[PDB]
Amino acid sequence: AMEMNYARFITAASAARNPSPIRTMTDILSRGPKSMISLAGGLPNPNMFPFKTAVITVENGKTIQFGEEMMKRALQYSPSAGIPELLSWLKQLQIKLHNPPTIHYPPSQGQMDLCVTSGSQQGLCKVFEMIINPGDNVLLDEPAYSGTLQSLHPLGCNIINVASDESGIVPDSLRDILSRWKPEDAKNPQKNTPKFLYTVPNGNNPTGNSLTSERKKEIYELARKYDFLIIEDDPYYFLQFNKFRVPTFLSMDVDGRVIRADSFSKIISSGLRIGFLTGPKPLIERVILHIQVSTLHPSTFNQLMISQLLHEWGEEGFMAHVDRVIDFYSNQKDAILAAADKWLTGLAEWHVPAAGMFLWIKVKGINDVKELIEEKAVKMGVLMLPGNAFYVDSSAPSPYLRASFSSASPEQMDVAFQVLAQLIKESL
């Protein structure tokens, strides 16, 4: 256990955030009798709200019902970090799946803390705003999620690009990048050593490539040596195609240097906007205070829908669900790889996605696929995504295409790649 200095990863603005007056009140109300008349809060009267009951049908589960009182709770303000029954369910899930070393650490030493967020990306945006001053160095691997790049761009950090391949980030690249600094330079803020490494360790959007166990051990040792955070943005953790899931950065986080984002967006609902951050208490605390002044909390309604489903499923029923979803996406993956093999062998290069929704295709011989897709393929009713958007320099030419296998039938994929092959052939 290396002694962390979280002040180093919190901006002056972030550190200036004071606690809610609401929490001061609720703590006074606890040190005091339950038979209480409080006119001190700012809750509106929930009996004025026009939604009264809710019945919601479910796969392989008892129907979810909001009675009159539960509905009034669902329509009312709730805690910033999330409703307690969901938070505690999720805390038990994280202990079962990742058994983080930080569980029983003291708060100031990076004790594991959770925060339910309005989607996992709200969590990360908050994390990036917490950490980054202009001119700070951050590490990631291009191709990278376009949302992350669009989020980091206005913050004025320098993105130092780490090499990646079929197995995610190449730690051998990271090591060479870091040799620029001496390990002692982490103790000196004028030397400007990397604040963090961001990655999507399973099923990277857009590549489909997942890190291996061994590479995560190497990355963690480098993060320990040069004393940076690892931001583990892991929305396809529950869409891994291999039988045994790869150990997370969180699971090996002896130092309390890992902030993890989990997403319900591909397994439970994207539209509900319920994800969660898991990380060291001092950093999670900063994120929570920012949420207090922006969204206040994620939808109470949508949390109670998800929490009731998860409590009646149990961990067993939840993991049975993710297994059915993995099976679906694994068949879709096999279908798109078949269409790839049939139409693009000799015209394009690609790897087998280890997780997620995307096949990432390099077109041989064509420097920029943007003209082929946007001017020709579109007019023929086919579209894949040019790779341009997944690099910091998006105006640079890209031969790559991101192709989602989430929705399309085998009949549609076949047509799509036949058209692509035809267009590649008439462009060379």
Which range touches a second copy (CB under 8 A), out of 162-170, 191-199, 208-216, 396-404? 396-404
- In the window 125-164, what residues touch ligand MVQ (CB under 6 A)? 146-147
Which range touches a second copy (CB under 8 A), out of 32-40, 101-109, 178-186, 210-218? 32-40
Cα dihedral 309→317→354→279 (10° resolution): 60
The token pair at 164 is: 């990646």
The token pair at 103 is: 């569980």
- In the window 90-129, what residues touch a second copy (CB under 8 A)? 118-119, 121-122, 125-126
Please state, in angstroms and rounded to a whole number, the distance separating the CA atoms of residues 153 and 142.
Answer: 14
The reply to whether 150 sits near a second copy by the rule CB under 8 A is yes
Closer to ligand MVQ by Cβ: residue 9 or 390: 390
Closer to ligand MVQ by Cβ: residue 146 or 192: 146
Give the other-Cβ count within 10 Å of 81's Cβ. 23
Long-range contacts from 5-13, C-beta under 8 angstroms, 24+ separation: 6/110, 6/280, 6/282, 6/283, 8/189, 9/130, 9/131, 9/195, 9/196, 9/229, 9/283, 10/130, 10/131, 10/282, 10/283, 10/286, 11/129, 11/130, 11/131, 11/132, 11/133
Nearest-approach distance from CB 262 to a second copy, in angstroms: 15
Nearest-approach distance from CB 130 to Cl ion, in angstroms: 13
Nearest-approach distance from CB 18 to a second copy, in angstroms: 6
- Count of residues near Cl ion by CB under 5 A: 2
Which of 14, 137, 209, 278 binds a second copy (CB under 8 A)? It is: 14
Cα dihedral 97→102→106→112 (10° resolution): -50
Which of 23, 52, 96, 342 binds a second copy (CB under 8 A)? It is: 52
Please state, in angstroms and rounded to a whole number, the distance separating the CA atoms of residues 254 and 119.
Answer: 27
Nearest-approach distance from CB 390 to a second copy, in angstroms: 9
Question: Site map for ligand MVQ, 268-307, x if CB under 6 A?
Answer: ----------------------------x-----------
Buried-state track 373-387, b at ≥16 Cβ within 10 A, e below 16 = beebbeeeebebbbb
Residue type, 357: M
Say if residue 143 is preceded by a cis peptide, omega within 30 of 0. Answer: yes
Residue 79 contacts which entry, Cl ion, ligand MVQ, a second copy, none (Cβ below 5-8 A, type-dependent)? ligand MVQ
Residue 269 contacts which entry, Cl ion, ligand MVQ, a second copy, none (Cβ below 5-8 A, type-dependent)? a second copy
Which range touches a second copy (CB under 8 A), out of 11-19, 102-110, 161-169, 245-253? 11-19
Please state, in angstroms and rounded to a whole number, the distance separating the CA atoms of residues 185 and 376.
Answer: 52
Binding region for ligand MVQ (CB under 6 A): 21-22, 25, 40-43, 77-79, 146-147, 205, 296, 385, 389
Query: Which residues carry a binding-site annotation for substrate?
Result: 23, 77, 145, 205, 402
